[PDB]
Scaffold this active site. Structure first.
Site, PDB file in Angstrom:
ATOM      1  N   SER A 140       0.837  -1.022   0.093  1.00 29.34           N
ATOM      2  CA  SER A 140      -0.075  -0.114   0.145  1.00 29.34           C
ATOM      3  C   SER A 140       0.938   1.171  -0.151  1.00 29.34           C
ATOM      4  CB  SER A 140      -0.937   0.082   1.186  1.00 29.34           C
ATOM      5  OG  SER A 140      -1.544   1.307   1.325  1.00 29.34           O
ATOM      6  N   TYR A 155      -1.292  -1.078   9.941  1.00 31.80           N
ATOM      7  CA  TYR A 155      -1.588  -1.156   8.471  1.00 31.80           C
ATOM      8  C   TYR A 155      -0.382  -0.842   7.703  1.00 31.80           C
ATOM      9  CZ  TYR A 155      -3.536  -1.858   3.926  1.00 31.80           C
ATOM     10  OH  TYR A 155      -3.828  -2.224   2.451  1.00 31.80           O
ATOM     11  N   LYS A 159       2.212  -3.626   5.862  1.00 33.43           N
ATOM     12  CA  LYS A 159       2.393  -3.501   4.404  1.00 33.43           C
ATOM     13  C   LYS A 159       3.748  -3.202   4.046  1.00 33.43           C
ATOM     14  CE  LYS A 159      -1.598  -4.594   2.762  1.00 33.43           C
ATOM     15  NZ  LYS A 159      -1.869  -6.074   2.208  1.00 33.43           N
TER      16      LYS A 159
END
Lengths: 244, 238, 239, 240
Positions: A140, A155, A159
């Site tokens: 991401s 997150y 990622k």
């Protein structure tokens, strides 16, 4: 038919409007047979059936080593090979640094990072035996620019860990012709009613959100022979949201 | 005296030969009071006393929320503030992709990534209240180039995760003047083969990493946040 | 086909063994009509005819504003539009830092950097008027890792300058839907053993590898990509 | 004193409020003797005199090979060595892609890119003979993010070219212990400024001193194991 005769396994592709399902659809359109692996068997089988004929749906929690291995074995028994692995499974959570509990960290890291490791571990042996393969890992833009979009810092961390893992596997398995590359999608429309949408869009030179199909098309590139000389690449799909 | 009047907490600094201790030594030389947090209480206390006067040694597993909370509270009770956090704690393992077991992944990810999160979570509240701070996270060239040095793919992943977390915290807390930056050291003191690919023709020293941490901890870097600072001798130019 | 109905202008594509010609061939296979722009008119015309039917060859020094303007005008008069611009023209020189003379710097910077600017300036107005386009710029792994392959520091500088220009144009023209992206090829077949040892995939690049990445960036498969630097280096540089 | 006993040459440092002068001041505070090289001899000499005692001002257009070489020779004759080179000279121009004329391209590329090459070429031989050195090149966040700040695309290109040149020189001269690194400053000190400022996590524009302090780090032994590095000084404007 960029994927004619190929077999691709895509995790997290049972949901209708997700990146995974869009990738499965485009892969099937390009001639691949697709194995959808997600949490619910019925949902995965229904998604595979929707792609067309000759596809497969299997159930696995990507953070469960033995279930992943059993699913991969079922896929290999039926198709005899897995040419392409799309590690698309992943969950986000819009919380801030100080609110991340141990259980939040575990859930987010397990689906993205541990799941990518486990599924890659399960597929790599057959790819070595088959003379190569292409593994695409889903990261991401949040991993690159430090969040600020939706997913919280865990997150972004998960990622970013995927990028480090992917690059390490690319280096280890280059001699086996197992290419390992990552996608870093920006803000992608999936399952925009908040005023915060204006600030984000103002920072996207192309002036629109990404579509699941945009990510799927970049995955198609990395899965296909059009990228035969690419390994260890991080391919941004962000509309210019991050130029660097 | 680049760190005059400052208080710095450094994890994993009990060992004499580590980057952590080298950073504690240089920080103390530059005027800081240092809190060494490591696994062994006696070793941490002895390391703190070796720095000089006014320092502190505490015991905590950085991946243990309760132990980290107790250590940070003891430090704040004594010093009243923590200006600088060096998340130096980390472990490596030279095992390849297919040999990484659940316990290997957990151990390596816990010390570097979860430890950086837990320690940062414990210190950030006081930094917010005190008008800012500097957090330095320890990554590795392995996170950038895909290993190939010593640590296996789970080490590369853990140290890359540290970068993602550091950048996310930098963005969240910029308004609080909490700067968050990372170091990506190269090979720090088979060696001959790696040495051949290093333009400066030597391996890194613990002091090299400590001096980069000093820069990021000091006011010389007051306008830097979200930075990844390579300390690799040219091993990776990009 | 991925480029059905599209018109693509590719600079430096006259030579049979170059990345430019390989890109022209693959683009033509994918349905595009190709305008080859290179230094020699006859060679460019012959290359265009070798692609098939409906293509065009024109002569221009990409660093010459007047010649570029004339070529783009002839292309637009015939095709009415240019959907894709591949700024492939570029030269290299294997000379070290202290040996770079003014004329060496000028020649290398002119073909890659000034040529990319001049050709992009000439094509952008029509792309803006026609609702968008895709511009692909040719850089090099040398711009990222600091040379060490073949081209000297002025080549690394020129190809790094291309990246900065491409990114700036990507940001400026995003609202016009003109995507601008760059390729950073590694060592391409157009001392080898030593470099080959540092390539995980165990081979050198082929002109077709770069052409296929250009195809991706020129096609709608990359419709959401702008400002991207796409490495085509076999793992030579992982970062 | 991080630069005690060192000799540093800084281009484009004659102006009082510039990054170059701020770097000269901080370098002098840290014990270095500074050679200011700029277009106007009088301005450069007055700037060196303002630093304190023992400094030098010289005149050179960084895009004039022979004038640069003559200036460096005068500096080496007086100091006997140049330990540090700060390639700070550079000009910007706020013009958009389609408005860049040949003369605009030439001017901007000449000061930043050609000047960095020429001045580095002039100083490197003595650094090899003296056992090493530290060269700091001035780039810009514009080279990384594709402009959008002030300088036009030719400025972004020139400053990106500087990064490519610096990395290539770092690789070539590592064995000679000549470290070569770059700084990428962000927006350094109304609607345009306010919009940019809103995207800076630290909530302020940079100061010349911020860039000077990063140059000090790269010039000093605190960065002895760094070469080929690009060091962002942008307040979080670009996190990547």
């Amino acid at each position: 038919m960029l994927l004619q005769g190929k077999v691709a396994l895509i995790t997290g592709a049972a949901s209708e409007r997700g990146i995974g399902r869009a990738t499965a659809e485009i892969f099937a359109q390009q001639g691949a047979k697709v194995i959808i692996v997600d949490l619910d068997l019925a949902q995965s089988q229904n998604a595979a059936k929707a792609l067309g004929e000759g596809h497969m749906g299997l159930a696995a929690n990507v953070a469960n080593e033995e279930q992943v291995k059993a699913a991969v074995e079922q896929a290999l028994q039926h198709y005899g090979k897995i040419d392409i692995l799309i590690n698309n499974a992943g969950i986000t959570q819009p919380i801030k640094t100080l609110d991340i509990q141990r259980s939040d960290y575990d859930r987010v890291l397990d689906v993205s990072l541990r799941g990518t490791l486990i599924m890659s571990q399960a597929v790599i042996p057959s790819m070595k035996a088959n003379g190569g393969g292409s593994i695409v890992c889903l990261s991401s833009v949040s991993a690159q620019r430090g969040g600020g979009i939706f997913g919280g810092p865990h997150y972004s961390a998960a990622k970013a860990g995927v990028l480090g893992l992917a690059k390490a596997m690319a280096r280890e398995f280059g001699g086996d012709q197992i290419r390992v590359n990552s996608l870093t999608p920006g803000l992608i429309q999936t399952d925009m009613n908040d005023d915060r949408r204006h600030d984000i869009l103002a920072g996207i030179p192309l002036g629109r959100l990404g579509k699941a199909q945009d990510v799927a098309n970049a995955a198609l590139f990395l899965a296909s022979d059009l990228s035969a000389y690419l390994t260890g690449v991080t391919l941004d799909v962000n509309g210019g949201m991050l130029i660097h």
